[PDB]
Design a protein. Sequence first.
Lengths: 28, 28, 28, 28, 28, 42, 42, 42, 42, 42, 34, 34, 34, 34, 34
Amino acid sequence: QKLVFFAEXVGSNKGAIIGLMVGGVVIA
Amino acid sequence: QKLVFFAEXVGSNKGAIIGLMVGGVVIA
Amino acid sequence: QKLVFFAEXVGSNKGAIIGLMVGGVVIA
Amino acid sequence: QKLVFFAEXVGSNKGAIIGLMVGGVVIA
Amino acid sequence: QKLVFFAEXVGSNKGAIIGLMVGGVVIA
Amino acid sequence: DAEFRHXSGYEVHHQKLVFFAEXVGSNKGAIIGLMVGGVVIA
Amino acid sequence: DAEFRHXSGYEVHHQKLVFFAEXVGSNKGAIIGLMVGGVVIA
Amino acid sequence: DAEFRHXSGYEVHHQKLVFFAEXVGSNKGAIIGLMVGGVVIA
Amino acid sequence: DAEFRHXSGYEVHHQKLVFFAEXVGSNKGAIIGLMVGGVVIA
Amino acid sequence: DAEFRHXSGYEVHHQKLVFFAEXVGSNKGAIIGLMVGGVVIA
Amino acid sequence: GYEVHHQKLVFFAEXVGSNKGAIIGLMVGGVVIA
Amino acid sequence: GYEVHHQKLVFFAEXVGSNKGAIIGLMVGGVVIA
Amino acid sequence: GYEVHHQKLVFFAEXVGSNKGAIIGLMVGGVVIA
Amino acid sequence: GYEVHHQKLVFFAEXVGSNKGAIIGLMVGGVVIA
Amino acid sequence: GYEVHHQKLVFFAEXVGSNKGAIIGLMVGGVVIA
């Protein structure tokens, strides 16, 4: 699994980025 | 699984980006 | 599975982007 | 699993970035 | 698992970055 | 697995309420004698 | 696993309330004689 | 595992409340004779 | 494991309250005769 | 393991409160005759 | 000429509330992207 | 000419409330990206 | 000409409340990115 | 010509409240990145 | 010509309250990165 986040400017993350989710609880 | 997020300007994430979801609960 | 999200300007994510959904609950 | 976060400008993280989630609880 | 955080400018982290999450509770 | 659950139990009895209105003009909000729980958006 | 839970038990009884409104003009908010819990946005 | 929980037990009884409003003009906020818990955003 | 919990037990009884409003003009905040717990944002 | 917990037990009884309002114009904050606990942001 | 005397915008979301869009009480100019 | 006498924007989210967008009580100019 | 007499922006989040976006009581100019 | 007489921005978060974005009571100029 | 008579920015977080972003009572110029 290859994930790319290129943002020429204002690159921000406020949610949930998950390569693989097998279980558990994620709240963003 | 190759995922590309290119944003020339204002690139933001506030939801849920999941490459593979096998279980669990994800709330954005 | 190749996913491309190119946005020349204002690229934002607020929903759910899932390459493969096998189970669980995803609430955007 | 290769994850890239390149941001030419203002690159910030305020949410949840998880390579692999098997269990537990994550709140951003 | 290779995770890259390159930011040519202001690179900051205020959320939760987890290589592998098997258990426990994380609040960002 | 997430589990969301809520709600309330009300037990109201054996009460005497005298409601008298001799001069409420052009009311546009809320006029409540007695409010046990619930949501009021005036 | 996340578990969210709330809510309240109300037991109100044996009360005497006299409500008298002889001059409430152009009311635009909330006028509550008695409020036991709940949410009020006037 | 996270566990969020709240809520409040109310037991209000045996009270006498005389409410008299003879001059409340152009009210735009909250007028509460008595508030036991809850939220008021006037 | 995280565990968040709160809430308050209210037991209010045996009181006499006389509320008299003969001159409250253009109120935009909160006018509370008595407040036991809770949140008030005037 | 983290454990967060709070809340307060209120037991208010046997009081006499005379609230008299004759000259409160253009109020924009809080006018509370008696406050037991809670949060007031005037 | 514009005049707003009273305006209320109440958002009561008892559950999994959210707002992914703009909530503008009075829009006159500029650009709002949400 | 603009005049706003009273304005309220109440956001009561008793659960998992959130705001991923803009909440502007009065917008006149500029750019707001949320 | 702009004149705001009363304005309230109340945010009551009794749970896992959050704000990932802008909350602007009066926007006149500039750029707000959230 | 801008004049604000009263303004309130109340934030009551009785839980896991947080703010990842801007909370501006009056924005006139400049750039705010959050 | 800008004039603010009364302003309040109250942040009541009875729990795990936090602020990862900017809280500006009056923004006129400069750059704020949060």
